[PDB]
């Protein structure tokens, strides 16, 4: 459920004395990976990761591939600068990550924008929601802040986010319509395992659903129950769908008082299920 979205997750990893740093850029529309670039590839190039992407012309691929080379240069340089700012030795490996893009409202106009940077997996600098001011995580990032405040970096980003980002998103949605905007309903069931003396584990299963956005919850006597509910990370089935489960420990003999609720956009009505013997 929600606003449509576009993002890029870009990463560079330094390989001191083993070559150039590894560079990878992954693109997403509505949280679906649709393009990818890996520098360690044999013909480093942006590749379509979705079938509806294969309708772009060769020149699309060339141009973005050029961007990628520019980006490699960018990351390499900034990786070196950061070694400076943090007083670190040049033989160690390090990470630089950039995440950016837009959420778009139903009108087709910009709801929210993102520009965020991490170094060695920790926050470095991020564009606030106003798209005008920066949050800097430490004094090293403060330097970049002053520098970017005087350079007008925020407007540069804002021009991309309000213009290019939204329009590309709109084109992509038009093209990938049939596959991006579909639903696969969850298949649900409950399983029963002994656990301790007088105690049993009930496990609610949700399988083969797309998209990944889902909510599972237990219930005692029709009231929501999340207390001590073990919930695992949503995981990919590997065929485009997801899985998830939720468990609770309940008294032996009292299982009939519990129910599992599944919420997902694919369902015409929420599921309510219980452990059914034999």
């Amino acid at each position: 459920a929600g606003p449509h979205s576009m993002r890029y997750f870009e990463t560079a990893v330094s390989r001191p004395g083993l070559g150039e740093p590894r560079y990878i850029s992954v693109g997403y529309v509505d949280n679906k990976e649709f393009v990818r670039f890996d520098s360690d590839a044999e013909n480093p190039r942006y590749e379509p990761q979705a079938p509806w992407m294969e309708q772009e012309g060769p020149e699309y691929w060339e141009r973005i591939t050029q961007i990628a080379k520019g980006q490699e240069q960018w990351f390499r340089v900034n990786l070196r600068t950061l070694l400076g700012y943090y007083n670190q030795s040049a033989g160690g490996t390090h990470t630089l990550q950039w995440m950016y893009g837009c959420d778009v409202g139903s009108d087709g106009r910009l709801l929210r924008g993102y520009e965020q940077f991490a170094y060695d997996g920790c926050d470095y600098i991020a564009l606030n929601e106003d798209l005008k001011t920066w949050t800097a995580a430490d004094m090293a990032a403060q330097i970049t802040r002053r520098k970017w405040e005087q350079a007008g970096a925020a407007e540069y980003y804002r021009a991309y986010l309000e213009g290019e980002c939204v329009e590309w998103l709109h084109r992509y949605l038009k093209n990938g319509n049939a596959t991006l905007l579909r639903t696969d309903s969850p298949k649900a069931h409950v399983t029963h395992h002994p656990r301790s003396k007088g105690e049993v584990t009930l496990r609610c299963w949700a399988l083969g659903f797309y998209p990944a956005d889902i909510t599972l919850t237990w219930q005692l006597n029709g009231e929501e129950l999340t207390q001590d509910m073990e919930l695992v990370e949503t995981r990919p089935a590997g065929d485009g769908t997801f899985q998830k489960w939720a468990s609770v420990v309940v008294p032996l003999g009292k299982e009939q008082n519990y129910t599992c609720r599944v919420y997902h956009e694919g369902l015409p009505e929420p599921l309510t299920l219980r452990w059914e013997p034999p």
């Binding site: 850029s25 973005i64 980006q71 960018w74 520098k147 970096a153 540069y156 290019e164």
Partner: peptide, 9 residues
């Protein structure tokens, strides 16, 4: 379509 980071640290 992706974008230049452009600004430097």
């Amino acid at each position: 379509s992706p974008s230049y980071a452009y600004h430097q640290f």
